[PDB]
């Protein structure tokens, strides 16, 4: 099998309550306290909207929910009030219902999106490493609660680059981490999918996470974004393999004993493990470092066991100008 290096039992270590989501029961307060303003975004089970609650004036964020998914919606109120106070967790402010639809709402704290895609073009060396480290603890805390967020990428990684604030969002599709248990493998975006998801291997851990977290390294020091830039899932497994290597790949499979989907015998080819530094150009020079390459060669790795931790990768060199910095 497999396991978590870290926080493996916490779960099983905590009362029952903590973790049996489908035994929770929120408390719903009212929607009518909120003016929508503006649409923010929407997605396959949710929509977001900036309001403003009428009773206090604050600006916060609305998450209206397709009301079906009464599990999926117990899960990530669950999960949240799990994260409550948790450093750089997007803050639940409440849980509402329209009080005649009973149609369910997340409110979250409001926080100022820069676009990634621009803001991602102009990082400084420092600013890479400071959000890297905020986004770092986000993980470690959660990882450290028992949950595996599954869905980290850019546009889950609000960042307020005016006031330096960082918050991980959307925690619907996060579950909590058991050992042994059996994941489904159709979690994260495809750029930011691990290995083990794209391989069909189903008894992966907090680690996925570290995986979606290089993949946003990569493209931030070397400003390839997305830094693997799959076609379809079959291909993404081929963007991996001709940097990380296919014996390498193949070395992986056979320590976990997986089995691979036969149609990656026609795409896969042969390739050679790459160097980082064959990602450096005139135009990233100045945001790589040796320490970067380091961090970085840690985290994109196939075997998740081997993976940096989330707190392995904040103890790392790379983020001591950010810890002498906030010291
Ligand atoms: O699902 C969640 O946990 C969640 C929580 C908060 C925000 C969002 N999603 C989005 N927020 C924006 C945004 C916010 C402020 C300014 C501009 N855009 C765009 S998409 C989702």
Redesign the pocket.
Known sequence: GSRARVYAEVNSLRSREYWDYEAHVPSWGNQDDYQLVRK??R?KY?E?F?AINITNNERV?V?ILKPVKKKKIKREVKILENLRGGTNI?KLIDTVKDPVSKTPA?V??????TDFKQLYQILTDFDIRFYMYELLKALDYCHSKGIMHRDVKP?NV?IDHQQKKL?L????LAEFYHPAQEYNVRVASRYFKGPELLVDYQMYDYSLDMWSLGCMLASMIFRREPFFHGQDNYDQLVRIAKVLGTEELYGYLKKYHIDLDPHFNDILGQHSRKRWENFIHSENRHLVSPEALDLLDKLLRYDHQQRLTAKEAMEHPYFYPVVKEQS
């Open positions: 923010l975004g997605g949710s977001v900036e964020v998450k997007i997340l979250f704290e409001y926080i100022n999106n546009h609000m918050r969002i959307d925690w619907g």
